[PDB]
Structure 1
Amino acid sequence: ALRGTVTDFSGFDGRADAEVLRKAMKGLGTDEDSILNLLTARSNAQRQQIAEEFKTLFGRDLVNDMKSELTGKFEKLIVALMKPSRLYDAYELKHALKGAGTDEKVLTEIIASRTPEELRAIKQAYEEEYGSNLEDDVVGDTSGYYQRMLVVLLQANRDPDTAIDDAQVELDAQALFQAGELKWGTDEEKFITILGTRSVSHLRRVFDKYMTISGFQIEETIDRETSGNLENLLLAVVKSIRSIPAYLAETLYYAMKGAGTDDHTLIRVIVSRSEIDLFNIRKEFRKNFATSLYSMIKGDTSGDYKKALLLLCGGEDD
C-alpha cells in the first residue's frame, strides 16, 4: 500500500544524462526545460549516479553548476531533489535549528511524522554530516514540554506493535481523561509518555476508547488543554498516528490554501516523500479537501517551478 510517484527509470544511462545536462547549461542561457524533464524522471539514487558521471566526464560539480545557472524557487526545488535522500531530512532540520531562533514548523513536522527507523537513520546521518548531535541541538534551541516531547520522539523507541490488550487500552484512555479534562491544569508529562511511547496500533484503539469515555476526540482535548508549540506537536503526533499520509496531505493543503504559498513546505513535503508515500498523500488530499493536489499546485505556482512540481506529483484526480 505505501507508494511514491518517482521510480527508477528503466534503461538509465548515467553517462548519456550527464551529457544532456552539460549541453542544457553550456553557453549563454540555460535550457531549464531539459533539466526539469530529466531530473523529475530519475530516482534520487539515479540523480547521484548522474552527478558523479558528470564529474568524471567534465571535472565540474553538477549541483554547483545548477546553482550558477538557475534562480529562485526553481533553484531551491532542483537543489532539494539533488540532496541524497539519506541526508535531506537531516539537512532540513539543521537549517531549521540554524540562525538565532528556530523554525518549529519544520522540527514538529519531521520529528512527528518520521517513523522510529527513519529517526535513527536521520540522527546518524546528521552527526556524520554536521558533526553535531541532533538531540543536543534540539535541546539547545527549545524549552518546556515541547523540548521534552521532541527528545522523547528522538529516542526513536516507541513500543512495537503487538497483540492489543483491552485492559491496557482502557487504562490509558482513562489516564488521559484524568490527566486532562478532569484535572485543574494538565499533566503534560502523562500525555508525552503515553503519546510519545505507546505503539501506533495500541494508540489508535486508545483514541477511539477515549472518545467513548469523554465524548471528545483526543485532538479536541489537546486543543482545550494546551496551547502553542506543545499543542502543535501533540496534534502532529496524533494526526501522524492516525495516518502519516493524511497528516502530510493536510500540511500540504495549508502551505497553499492561504493567499501566498509556503514554498519551503511544499518543496520539502513533495521531495521528501516522492519516493515513499506521495501517491497515498494524493489520495488522502483528494478524499479530504475535495481538490486534486495537482490542481491545487497548478493553481498556486508558476514557471518551470510549477512544471517540475507537477511532473513530480503526477496525478489528475489526485
Structure 2
Amino acid sequence: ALRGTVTDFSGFDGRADAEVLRKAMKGLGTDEDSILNLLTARSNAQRQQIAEEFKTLFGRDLVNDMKSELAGKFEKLIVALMKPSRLYDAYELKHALKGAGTDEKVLTEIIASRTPEELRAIKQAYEEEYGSNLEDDVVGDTSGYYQRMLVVLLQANRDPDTAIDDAQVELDAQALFQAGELKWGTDEEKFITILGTRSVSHLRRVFDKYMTISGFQIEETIDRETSGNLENLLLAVVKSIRSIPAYLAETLYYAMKGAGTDDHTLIRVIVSRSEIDLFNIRKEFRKNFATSLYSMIKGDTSGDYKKALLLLCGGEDD
C-alpha cells in the first residue's frame, strides 16, 4: 500500500561511494553535483554505512565536512538526508520546542500524522538522544487544550481497528453533535477523547454519520467551534485519520502555494516521508491540486537545492 520514492541501492559499495564523496570535497571548492547525485540514490541506511566507511577511510566526519562545503538550503537539505530515520522526527521535534519559542506547526504536524507505533519509537529515540522526556518537554512548552490533545496523542494509545459497532458509531456522532453545534460553547474535552482515542476505522464511520446527522462535515464544525492551535491540531488529526498521505500532500502545497516557500516544511516532509509513503503523497497531490508535486517544486525552488529535491521526489506527471 504505502510507497516511498527512495530505495536501497543494488550494487552498493559503501567504500566506493565514500571515496567519491572525498574526491568531491577534497581541494578548492565542491562538486555539489556529485554529492547530490550520490546521496539521493541511496537509502538512509546506506547513507549511514557510507558515513561509516568515510570515517574509517579518512578519519573525518562526513556530515561535518559537508556542513563546511555546502551552504544554504542545499546544505540543510543534505544534512537532513544524512539524519538516521529513527532520529529525524525526534530531531525536528526537539528543535521545534527548544529555544524561547516553539514551532507549534511542527508539533502539530508530526504528532498528528505519525501512527502510535511511530510515536512510541519517536519517544524512545528522543529520550536516548537528548536525555529528556518528550512529553515533559511538550507539557512544558504548551498549554490549554492544545497541550492536552498532544499528550493524549503522545500516549500512542489509540484504540485498535476491529469490526465496526454501529450503535457505537451512532453514539459517538451524536456526542460530538451535542458537544459542539448543539452547545452554547464547546465541550473540547469530548472532542479530544473521541478524536484522540477511537480507532481509525471507527472514526471514519463517525465522520460520515456525523455529516448525515448534522448537515456539516466534522471539519466545518471544528472551524466553527474552535480557534487557534487547537483548531489546527484537530483539523490535522481529522485529516490524518481520513488519509496521512493527503494530509501531508496538503501541508506541502501550502508551503509553496504562497509567494515564497517554507523550505523548512518542504525539506521535512519530503525527507521524512521519502521511504514511507512519499509516492502516495504524490498521487494525492495531483488529484487534489491538479499539478504534480514535481512541477510545483520545479517552480518554487532552485540551485542544487532544487536539483536534489526533484530527484528525491521524482515523477513528472505526479
Q: TM-score range by the shorter chain?
A: over 0.9
Please list the CA deviations of residues 38-68 of structure 1 after superposition, one character each: whole Å capped at 9, or x if unmatched: 0000000000000000000000000000000
Please list the CA deviations of residues 263-308 of structure 1 after superposition, one character each: whole Å capped at 9, or x if unmatched: 0000000000000000000000000000000000000000000000
Q: Secondary structure at the match of 1:11?
A: coil
For 2:30, the equivalent position in structure 1 comes to 30
For 2:308 and 2:178, locate their aligned partners in 1 and report how far apart those are by CA, in whole Å: 50
For 1:255 and 1:217, locate their aligned partners in 2 and report how far apart those are by CA, in whole Å: 25
Describe how 1:175-254 pairs up with structure 2 within 5 A: 175-254=175-254
For 1:17 and 1:114, locate their aligned partners in 2 and report how far apart those are by CA, in whole Å: 33
2:293 matches 1:280:
no
For 1:246 and 1:212, locate their aligned partners in 2 and report how far apart those are by CA, in whole Å: 23
For 1:213 and 1:29, locate their aligned partners in 2 and report how far apart those are by CA, in whole Å: 65
For 2:33 and 2:102, locate their aligned partners in 1 and report how far apart those are by CA, in whole Å: 36
For 2:298 and 2:89, locate their aligned partners in 1 and report how far apart those are by CA, in whole Å: 26
For 1:84, the equivalent position in structure 2 comes to 84
For 2:94 and 2:172, locate their aligned partners in 1 and report how far apart those are by CA, in whole Å: 35
Q: Secondary structure at the match of 2:125?
A: helix
Please list the CA deviations of residues 142-192 of structure 1 after superposition, one character each: whole Å capped at 9, or x if unmatched: 000000000000000000000000000000000000000000000000000
1:119, distance to aligned residue in structure 2 (A): 0.1
For 1:108 and 1:314, locate their aligned partners in 2 and report how far apart those are by CA, in whole Å: 27
For 1:21, the equivalent position in structure 2 comes to 21
Structure 1: gaps (5+ residues) = none
For 1:108, the equivalent position in structure 2 comes to 108
For 1:186 and 1:40, locate their aligned partners in 2 and report how far apart those are by CA, in whole Å: 48
1:15, distance to aligned residue in structure 2 (A): 0.2
Please list the CA deviations of residues 69-115 of structure 1 after superposition, one character each: whole Å capped at 9, or x if unmatched: 00000000000000000000000000000110210000000000000
For 1:5 and 1:57, locate their aligned partners in 2 and report how far apart those are by CA, in whole Å: 30
For 1:205 and 1:89, locate their aligned partners in 2 and report how far apart those are by CA, in whole Å: 30
For 2:298 and 2:11, locate their aligned partners in 1 and report how far apart those are by CA, in whole Å: 30
Please list the CA deviations of residues 208-243 of structure 1 after superposition, one character each: whole Å capped at 9, or x if unmatched: 000000000000000000000000000000000000
For 1:173 and 1:312, locate their aligned partners in 2 and report how far apart those are by CA, in whole Å: 41
For 1:245 and 1:199, locate their aligned partners in 2 and report how far apart those are by CA, in whole Å: 18
For 1:316 and 1:75, locate their aligned partners in 2 and report how far apart those are by CA, in whole Å: 25
For 2:245 and 2:8, locate their aligned partners in 1 and report how far apart those are by CA, in whole Å: 22
1:5, distance to aligned residue in structure 2 (A): 0.1
Q: Secondary structure at the match of 2:264?
A: helix
For 1:168 and 1:313, locate their aligned partners in 2 and report how far apart those are by CA, in whole Å: 41
For 1:245 and 1:316, locate their aligned partners in 2 and report how far apart those are by CA, in whole Å: 18
Structure 2: gaps (5+ residues) = none
For 1:310 and 1:266, locate their aligned partners in 2 and report how far apart those are by CA, in whole Å: 12
For 1:258 and 1:94, locate their aligned partners in 2 and report how far apart those are by CA, in whole Å: 27
Q: Secondary structure at the match of 2:64?
A: helix
For 2:89 and 2:121, locate their aligned partners in 1 and report how far apart those are by CA, in whole Å: 10
1:317, distance to aligned residue in structure 2 (A): 1.2
User: Pairwise CA RMSD of aligned residues?
Assistant: 0.3
Q: Secondary structure at the match of 1:316?
A: coil
Please list the CA deviations of residues 8-39 of structure 1 after superposition, one character each: whole Å capped at 9, or x if unmatched: 01010000000000000000010000000000
For 2:304 and 2:166, locate their aligned partners in 1 and report how far apart those are by CA, in whole Å: 53
For 1:298 and 1:133, locate their aligned partners in 2 and report how far apart those are by CA, in whole Å: 40
Structure 2 length as normaliser, TM-score? 1.00
1:316, distance to aligned residue in structure 2 (A): 1.1
For 1:313, the equivalent position in structure 2 comes to 313
For 1:22 and 1:139, locate their aligned partners in 2 and report how far apart those are by CA, in whole Å: 44
For 2:247 and 2:237, locate their aligned partners in 1 and report how far apart those are by CA, in whole Å: 9
4+ residue runs of structure 1 moved beyond 2 angstroms? none
